[PDB]
């Protein structure tokens, strides 16, 4: 495990734990899903927790979250296209800096413009300054 991986895992956890109490509840999961245009039922959310709820306490702590993500990584093409469409708001096939800014603003991450442009440069493979579907695939896998 590298120093790099830990910061990434931390930021991903903090995305969900919007109140910062160090646990992820069904309500936080639902709120994050709805901010991305999804609509999960209470049963689906509980099943999502209980698929990783090692201690049976009804919330997700840090290592259970790691288990959830590692399981999900091992898991699909319909889903990847769905997320792409989550970001390609106007459907032109290229994720722009403006679209990523909009998504970040929806998630609650207060990121500067220069930082979003940095994210685009980091994910951009062909160097056109946008993220196409294939670059998105590369990012996921």
């Amino acid at each position: 495990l590298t120093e790099e991986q830990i910061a990434e895992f931390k930021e991903a956890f903090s995305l969900f734990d919007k109140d910062g109490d160090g646990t992820i509840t069904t309500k936080e999961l639902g709120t994050v899903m709805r901010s991305l245009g999804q609509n999960p039922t209470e049963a689906e959310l509980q099943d999502m927790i209980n698929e990783v709820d090692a201690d049976g306490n009804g919330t997700i702590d840090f290592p259970e979250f790691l288990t959830m993500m590692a399981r999900k990584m091992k898991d699909s093409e319909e889903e990847i296209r769905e997320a792409f469409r989550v970001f390609d708001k106007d459907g032109n096939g290229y994720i722009s800096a403006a679209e990523l800014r909009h998504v970040m603003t929806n998630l609650g991450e207060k990121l500067t413009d220069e930082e979003v442009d940095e994210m685009i440069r980091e994910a951009d493979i062909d160097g056109d300054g946008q993220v196409n579907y294939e670059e998105f695939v590369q990012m996921m896998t």
Partner: peptide, 23 residues
């Protein structure tokens, strides 16, 4: 449903943290 999970647990965090750790 699982798509949003895959997105918010695989690619996006790497970028956000790789840009945030530079400060």
């Amino acid at each position: 449903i699982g798509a949003v999970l895959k997105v918010l647990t695989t690619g996006l965090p790497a970028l956000i943290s790789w840009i945030k750790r530079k400060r």
